[PDB]
């Protein structure tokens, strides 16, 4: 999209993908980045394991 | 004319004192960790992590 390139300092609690999600405007790319950001595992107890 | 009773004097001085030169050799300095260097604004100098 030709926007100014980001300078993500090495050590901020935020992630580059989070900043990109907070920055860009287009729909599908932002949705995909948002999906890849917070996609965490789920703890499930099955059969005692 | 010369009179001995007049030329006599009690010069004043200091007892003893060690004169010091090249003083800064008595202080040593340690570099901070190069990564954790802070320049002027409470922030790291370089950030390209």
Nearest CA to A12 among B2, B27, B47, B17? B47
How does B31-49 read in b/e, with b if 16+ C-beta sit within 10 Å? Answer: eeeeeeeeeeeeeeeeeee
Chains A & B: contacts with CB separation below 8 Å = 13
Residue A7 with chain B: CB contacts under 8 Å: 47
How was this structure obtained?
cryo-EM
Q: What is the largest CA-CA distance in chain A?
A: 53
Which residues does A contribute to its contact with B (CB < 8 Å)?
A: 7-11
Note the Cα B4 to chain centre separation in Å: 45
- Separation between Cα atoms, residue B47 and residue B35, nearest integer Å: 9
How does A37-49 read in b/e, with b if 16+ C-beta sit within 10 Å? Answer: eeeeeeeeeeeee
Q: What is the resolution of this structure in A?
A: 4.7
């Amino acid at each position: 999209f030709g926007m100014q390139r980001m300078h993500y300092r090495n050590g901020d609690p935020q992630t580059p993908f989070q900043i990109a999600e907070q920055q860009i405007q287009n729909f599908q790319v932002a949705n995909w980045l948002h999906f890849v950001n917070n996609n965490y595992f789920r703890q499930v107890v099955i059969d005692g394991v | 004319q010369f009179d001995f009773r007049n030329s006599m004097h009690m010069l004043t001085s200091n007892l003893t004192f060690t004169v010091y030169s090249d003083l800064l050799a008595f202080v040593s300095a340690d570099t901070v960790e190069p990564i954790n260097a802070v320049a002027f604004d409470n922030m790291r100098i370089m950030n390209e992590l």
